[PDB]
Amino acid sequence: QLQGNKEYGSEKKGFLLKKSDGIRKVWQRRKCAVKNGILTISHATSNRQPAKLNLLTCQVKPNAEDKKSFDLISHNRTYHFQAEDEQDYIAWISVLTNSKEEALTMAFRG
């Protein structure tokens, strides 16, 4: 019995705001894409290869203090994101969860 939301797909490309780790923790706009249970998040600034997160090993956790915010929690690290509007918020949490669930279904089929 699978979580997500069928109103959305399992792939998305767009922008998200990400809170920086270090420099007074400022919010910064990054290019992000989900496909095949993988989330790719650009850094500032390529230069670097984008970060790649395996959603099967991450928790998606809506943020209790801002309506458009959510976190991705890996084994290692917490990423704080903010969508650019409420519609985009529901789309990202839905696509992330769908992508995870699809992939989990494939993994636990094999």
From Swiss-Prot:
Compartments (UniProt record): Cytoplasm; Membrane; Golgi apparatus; Golgi apparatus, trans-Golgi network
Entry comment describing in which tissues the protein is expressed: Expressed in all tissues examined but a most abundant expression was found in the testis, brain, lung and spleen. A heightened expression was seen in the adipose tissue from obese (ob) and diabetic (db) animals.
Annotated signal peptide: none
Domain PH: 9-101
Post-translational modifications reported in the UniProt record: Phosphorylated on tyrosine residues by SRC.
Subunit structure: Homodimer. Interacts with SRC and CRK. Interacts with RAB11FIP3. Interacts with PTK2B/PYK2. Interacts with REPS2; the interaction is direct. Forms a complex containing RAB11A, ASAP1, RAB3IP, RAP11FIP3 and ARF4; the complex promotes preciliary trafficking; the complex binds to RHO in photoreceptor cells and promotes RHO ciliary transport.
Function: May function as a signal transduction protein involved in the differentiation of fibroblasts into adipocytes and possibly other cell types. Possesses phosphatidylinositol 4,5-bisphosphate-dependent GTPase-activating protein activity for ARF1 (ADP ribosylation factor 1) and ARF5 and a lesser activity towards ARF6. May coordinate membrane trafficking with cell growth or actin cytoskeleton remodeling by binding to both SRC and PIP2.
Domain notes: The PH domain most probably contributes to the phosphoinositide-dependent regulation of ADP ribosylation factors.
Protein name: Arf-GAP with SH3 domain, ANK repeat and PH domain-containing protein 1
Protein's organism: Mus musculus (Mouse)
Residues shown, of full length: 331 to 440 of 1147
